[PDB]
A paper describes a structure:
The membrane-anchored SNARE (soluble N-ethylmaleimide-sensitive factor acceptor protein receptor) proteins provide the energy to drive membrane fusion in various cellular contexts, such as intracellular trafficking and exocytosis. Supercomplexes of NSF, α-SNAP, and either a syntaxin tetramer or one of two binary complexes of syntaxin—SNAP-25 reveal atomic details of SNARE processing and show how sequential ATP hydrolysis drives disassembly. NSF comprises three structured domains connected by flexible linkers—the adapter N-domain followed by the D1 and D2 AAA+ domains. Six NSF protomers come together to form the active form of the enzyme, a homo-hexamer.
To gain insight into the structural nature of binary complex formation and disassembly by NSF, we prepared a complex of NSF, ɑ-SNAP, and the binary t-SNARE complex (21bin20S) composed of full-length soluble SNAP-25 and soluble syntaxin-1a (1–267) in the absence of divalent cation (i.e., non-hydrolyzing conditions) and performed single-particle cryo-EM. Classes with evidence of NSF D1 domains engaging ordered ɑ-SNAP—SNARE sub-complexes were carried forward; eight 21bin20S models were built into reconstructions ranging from 3.39–4.01 Å in resolution, differing mainly in the orientation of N domains and a sub-complex of three ɑ-SNAP molecules and four SNARE motifs relative to the D1 ATPase ring. All classes revealed substrate-bound NSF without Mg2+ needed for ATP hydrolysis and disassembly, and share the same overall architecture, with a spire composed of NSF N-domains and the ɑ-SNAP—SNARE subcomplex on top, the NSF D1 ring in the middle tier, and the NSF D2 ring forming the bottom tier. A representative 21bin20S model (class #5, 3.39 Å) and ɑ-SNAP—2:1 binary SNARE subcomplex model (class #13, 3.74 Å). A Hexameric NSF engages the ɑ-SNAP—2:1 binary SNARE subcomplex via multiple N-domains (salmon), which engage three ɑ-SNAP molecules (gold) surrounding the 2:1 binary SNARE complex composed of two syntaxin H3 domains (dark red) and the SN1 and SN2 SNARE domains of a single SNAP-25 molecule (green). A linker N-terminal to one of the syntaxin H3 domains is found within the catalytic D1 ring of NSF (light blue). The D2 ring of NSF (purple) does not engage substrate. B NSF (light blue) engages one of the two syntaxin molecules in the 2:1 binary SNARE complex (dark red) via pore loop interactions involving Y294 (protomers A–F, indicated). Three ɑ-SNAP molecules bind the 2:1 binary SNARE complex; a flexible linker between SNAP-25 SN1 and SN2 blocks access by a fourth. Of the eight 21bin20S classes with the 2:1 binary SNARE complex from the dataset collected under non-hydrolyzing conditions, six engage syntaxin and two engage SNAP-25 within the pore of the D1 ring.
Numbering used by the authors:
A (entry chain G): 197 to 259
B (entry chain I): 41 to 82, 130 to 204
C (entry chain J): 0 to 286
D (entry chain H): 215 to 259
E (entry chain L): 0 to 23, 36 to 286
F (entry chain K): 0 to 24, 38 to 288
Write the structure that this text describes.
């Protein structure tokens, strides 16, 4: 009985370990990915604002 | 406790991620409509009993409790993992969209400057 | 170092130049009708002054420049940039002068809610409640702001965020010795959270608190509430919380203060207790 | 390892919040620009 | 089934009408209508014909003044052909990768490189061919500082080389990745495993130098001693010192009792033990 | 292979074309420069790609463009990162200056962190790394990003204890631990920081460490239960008797129960050496 219970406990511990490593690596990749999107969207919004401001000033200069 | 906090806050992150995806889709649709309009404008024990004694009991009982808790963790942990996977995909799906959006305005602006002269 | 003196001197010089520019703007407009180019340029100088002052660690000057820019650009009918600068003041004066940040954030909230942008207004309300809580013990204003933010979030259908606001409100109200609101909020959130896959694991905890908050009222209703909760959430029985409550009830049923204290000490030894739980247990022990 | 996972997840959450704020600003400005374009095209025509 | 016939007929009719319209400024409308017809074919689920129409529409879009649309249509055609002639999908995705690289977007190019390598290895038996694409994607990711993707590609190529019996490349990659992970505050827990794998590969060359290699790993990473892998491998080497088959069999059975050994590890163990 | 020679020749041709276009005197020249630098990057000619990027950035900044100029400056900086660390530092300093000018403090803090990283890893310099990390921490704390500021302060305190006086380490560890105790999720780790602080006090004198540990134990009751508290009490008692064997036995037993950071090993070796 000792062998069965002890090996069961060890197997459960190992399973938790492996799956936690997998999930944490996935989280790291996701973190890099979100870091990228932040700058992407910031630059997009800045450029659209700049372009539309140019549009307003040009159209008002012509009218 | 750390496990539970992780689960709840992961749920919140998923909600926020869905919200941003919806907002981005709305932005894309509005941008396309505006551009088109503008173009149209133109278990029995755990320790052997060598001497028995009270000391050998609590030990075993502790182990028992330990085992039970471990069980819970398994299910707990497994569940959490699933969530992350979904988020991964959704996160990817936004970049492309957003990227395309950005590209559009660029060319649009370029066109807005090329028709004039 | 050189940073303090140099940044201060250059910022004063630039701010004086901006003041001269705005002074001459009226004459330019009267004599030539230049439009808003002068005013926009002055606002640019003022925003730059505020940012440099922020770099120079002089938060008061940065906040004053931000407020001036907010006022000037609001005078130009640009309520969006005016609200942006009002929030700039709210976050700059936040540390230099909390009171000014309060009114700045109220102004920004009014401007935003004028357009129906409820999420930003709720975020600002939460920030203001945090400002009230961190420095002052004026709990009532924090409760009001949290209730307003929770109502806004519920009106936006964004669940799991109004929930946290309601939990904060209930926890703070329970401290004021008004238990009905705390009991109702705790039970409502617990019953909502039983059915969620991810949140299920946490649901039990809420019930515990409610029962403890139901304990001060009287013993008998606490017992019957325990029965009601257990029948609805049988897994609750497995948790140590039910065992601890049963032991405490048994100890108190015979005025056995020593057993109650020993059980509390043992439970704390296994897991450290929270200040809220410590206070609630001490209040119960008074009887 | 559990303690180690926690703060990574928290940082990801806050950073998501910042992105969400930026997105709300962008969409609001886009809607306002659309309204202005509609006004201009309708009134000039 | 009625649905397949109905969708096929509808998509055929739409493409025929699109062809008539284009045959009748006109380039943009032709491209759009061909895209609609190819989409309807995709809903009809005739993978070969749908992909052929999609690639023809992509070429016509190339005839039109646009690049991003061209690349998107190329990748869509490659995906459609994914369940068809691998050569056409490979060529279309290679052209899309070239077009993407020309704009400087190396990340999507590396992603497409990985995808084409995956289809090459899974569909065909050529592994060395997939090695080149994997290495190119790894180089692109390393140049862009995406350490995780580069590590994944390096691990895959090292495992393939180890299977191919090029133990030197496998050992170099395994050692480099293991030490890099050990340096990082995170992922350190996994580092041990890499070292262990290297030892096995190094054992293929000889047994005497395996002792020196394990001692070097031990001194470089003391924690590796407490790992069950170190105990198992030292026991296996000591048992192999004497020509007794039972000892290592019992050791591997004991280790396997806890966790099931993977196919690669089991194959490597059989290869070492049989000789 | 064809890649090297072909891309190099095309890059030289494009550079000459852009130089001729500017010789006519403009955005076309910048586009040609960017494309040539990209091809150089594909060619693996890491060096001289940052040169073309810097030239394009200067040409674009000539026409008041600042955002794309900063992006290309950062691009050239990272390109030179491996080929030439010093020019990477310079390009990143320029980008940091411009970004701070527009007030994008998060970008400036990230670039400062990268500068400190490159300074500490490739070159040998701690003071520059400490200054850059402190600047990034100040920027983030001004932006109220608590986690990043805590990380930077912890790194700075660790390095200061490693080489500099212990007062900075004492202050940073005490502050971080005090902030950490109240946090519900982070409370469990608080002990660690406090422990570290105490050890630094020991490097000065035993009595200072004793008073510091007494104050910490009073402030944090849970710290009394920590195995760390028992270990320091035993070590202090052993040191007070000039008995090195007890010191060694306690250290060995604690290491046997749990492995060592190799920082605690250094501090314990320093303390043991001065037991006399």
């Amino acid at each position: 009985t000792r062998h069965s219970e002890i090996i069961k406990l060890e197997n459960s511990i190992r399973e938790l370990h492996d799956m936690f490593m997998d999930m944490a690596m996935l989280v790291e990749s996701q973190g890099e990915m979100i870091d990228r999107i932040e700058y992407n969207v910031e630059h997009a919004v800045d450029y659209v604002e700049r372009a539309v401001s140019d549009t307003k000033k040009a159209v008002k200069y012509q009218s | 406790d750390a496990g539970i906090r992780t689960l709840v806050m992961l749920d919140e992150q998923g909600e926020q991620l869905e919200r941003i995806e919806e907002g981005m889709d709305q932005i894309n649709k509005d941008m396309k409509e505006a551009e088109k309009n503008l173009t149209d404008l133109g278990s029995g024990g755990f320790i052997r009993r060598v001497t028995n004694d009270a000391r050998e009991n609590e030990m075993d009982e502790n182990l028992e409790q330990v085992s039970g808790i471990i069980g819970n963790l398994r299910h707990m942990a497994l569940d959490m993992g699933n969530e992350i996977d979904t988020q991964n995909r959704q996160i990817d799906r936004i970049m492309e969209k957003a990227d395309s959006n950005k590209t559009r305005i660029d060319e649009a602006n370029q066109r807005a400057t090329k028709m004039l002269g | 170092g050189m940073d303090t003196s140099g940044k201060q001197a250059e910022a004063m010089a630039l701010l004086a130049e901006a003041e001269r520019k705005v002074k001459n703007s009226q004459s330019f407009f009267s004599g030539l009708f230049g439009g808003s180019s002068k005013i926009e340029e002055a606002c640019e100088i003022y925003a730059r002054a505020a940012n440099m002052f922020k770099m120079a660690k002089n938060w008061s000057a940065a906040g004053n420049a931000f407020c001036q820019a907010a006022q000037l650009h609001l005078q130009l009918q640009s309520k969006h940039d005016a609200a942006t600068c009002f929030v700039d003041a709210g976050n700059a004066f936040k540390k230099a002068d909390p009171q000014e940040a309060i009114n700045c954030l109220m102004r920004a909230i009014e401007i935003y809610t004028d357009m129906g942008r409820f999420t930003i207004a709720a975020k600002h309300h939460i920030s203001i409640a945090e400002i009230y809580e961190t420095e002052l013990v004026d709990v009532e204003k924090a409760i009001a702001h949290y209730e307003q933010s929770a109502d806004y979030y519920k009106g936006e259908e964004s669940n799991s965020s109004a929930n946290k606001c309601l939990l904060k409100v209930a926890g703070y109200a329970a401290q004021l010795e008004q238990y009905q609101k705390a009991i109702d909020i705790y039970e409502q959130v617990g019953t909502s959270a039983m059915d969620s896959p991810l949140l299920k694991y946490s649901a039990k905890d809420y019930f515990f608190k409610a029962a403890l908050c139901h304990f001060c009222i009287d013993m008998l209703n606490a017992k019957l509430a325990v029965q009601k909760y257990e029948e609805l959430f049988p897994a609750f029985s497995d948790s140590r919380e039910c065992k601890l409550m049963k032991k405490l009830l048994e100890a108190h049923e015979e005025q056995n203060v020593d057993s109650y204290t020993e059980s509390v000490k043992e439970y704390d030894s296994i897991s450290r207790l929270d200040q809220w739980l410590t206070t609630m247990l001490l209040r119960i022990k008074k009887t």
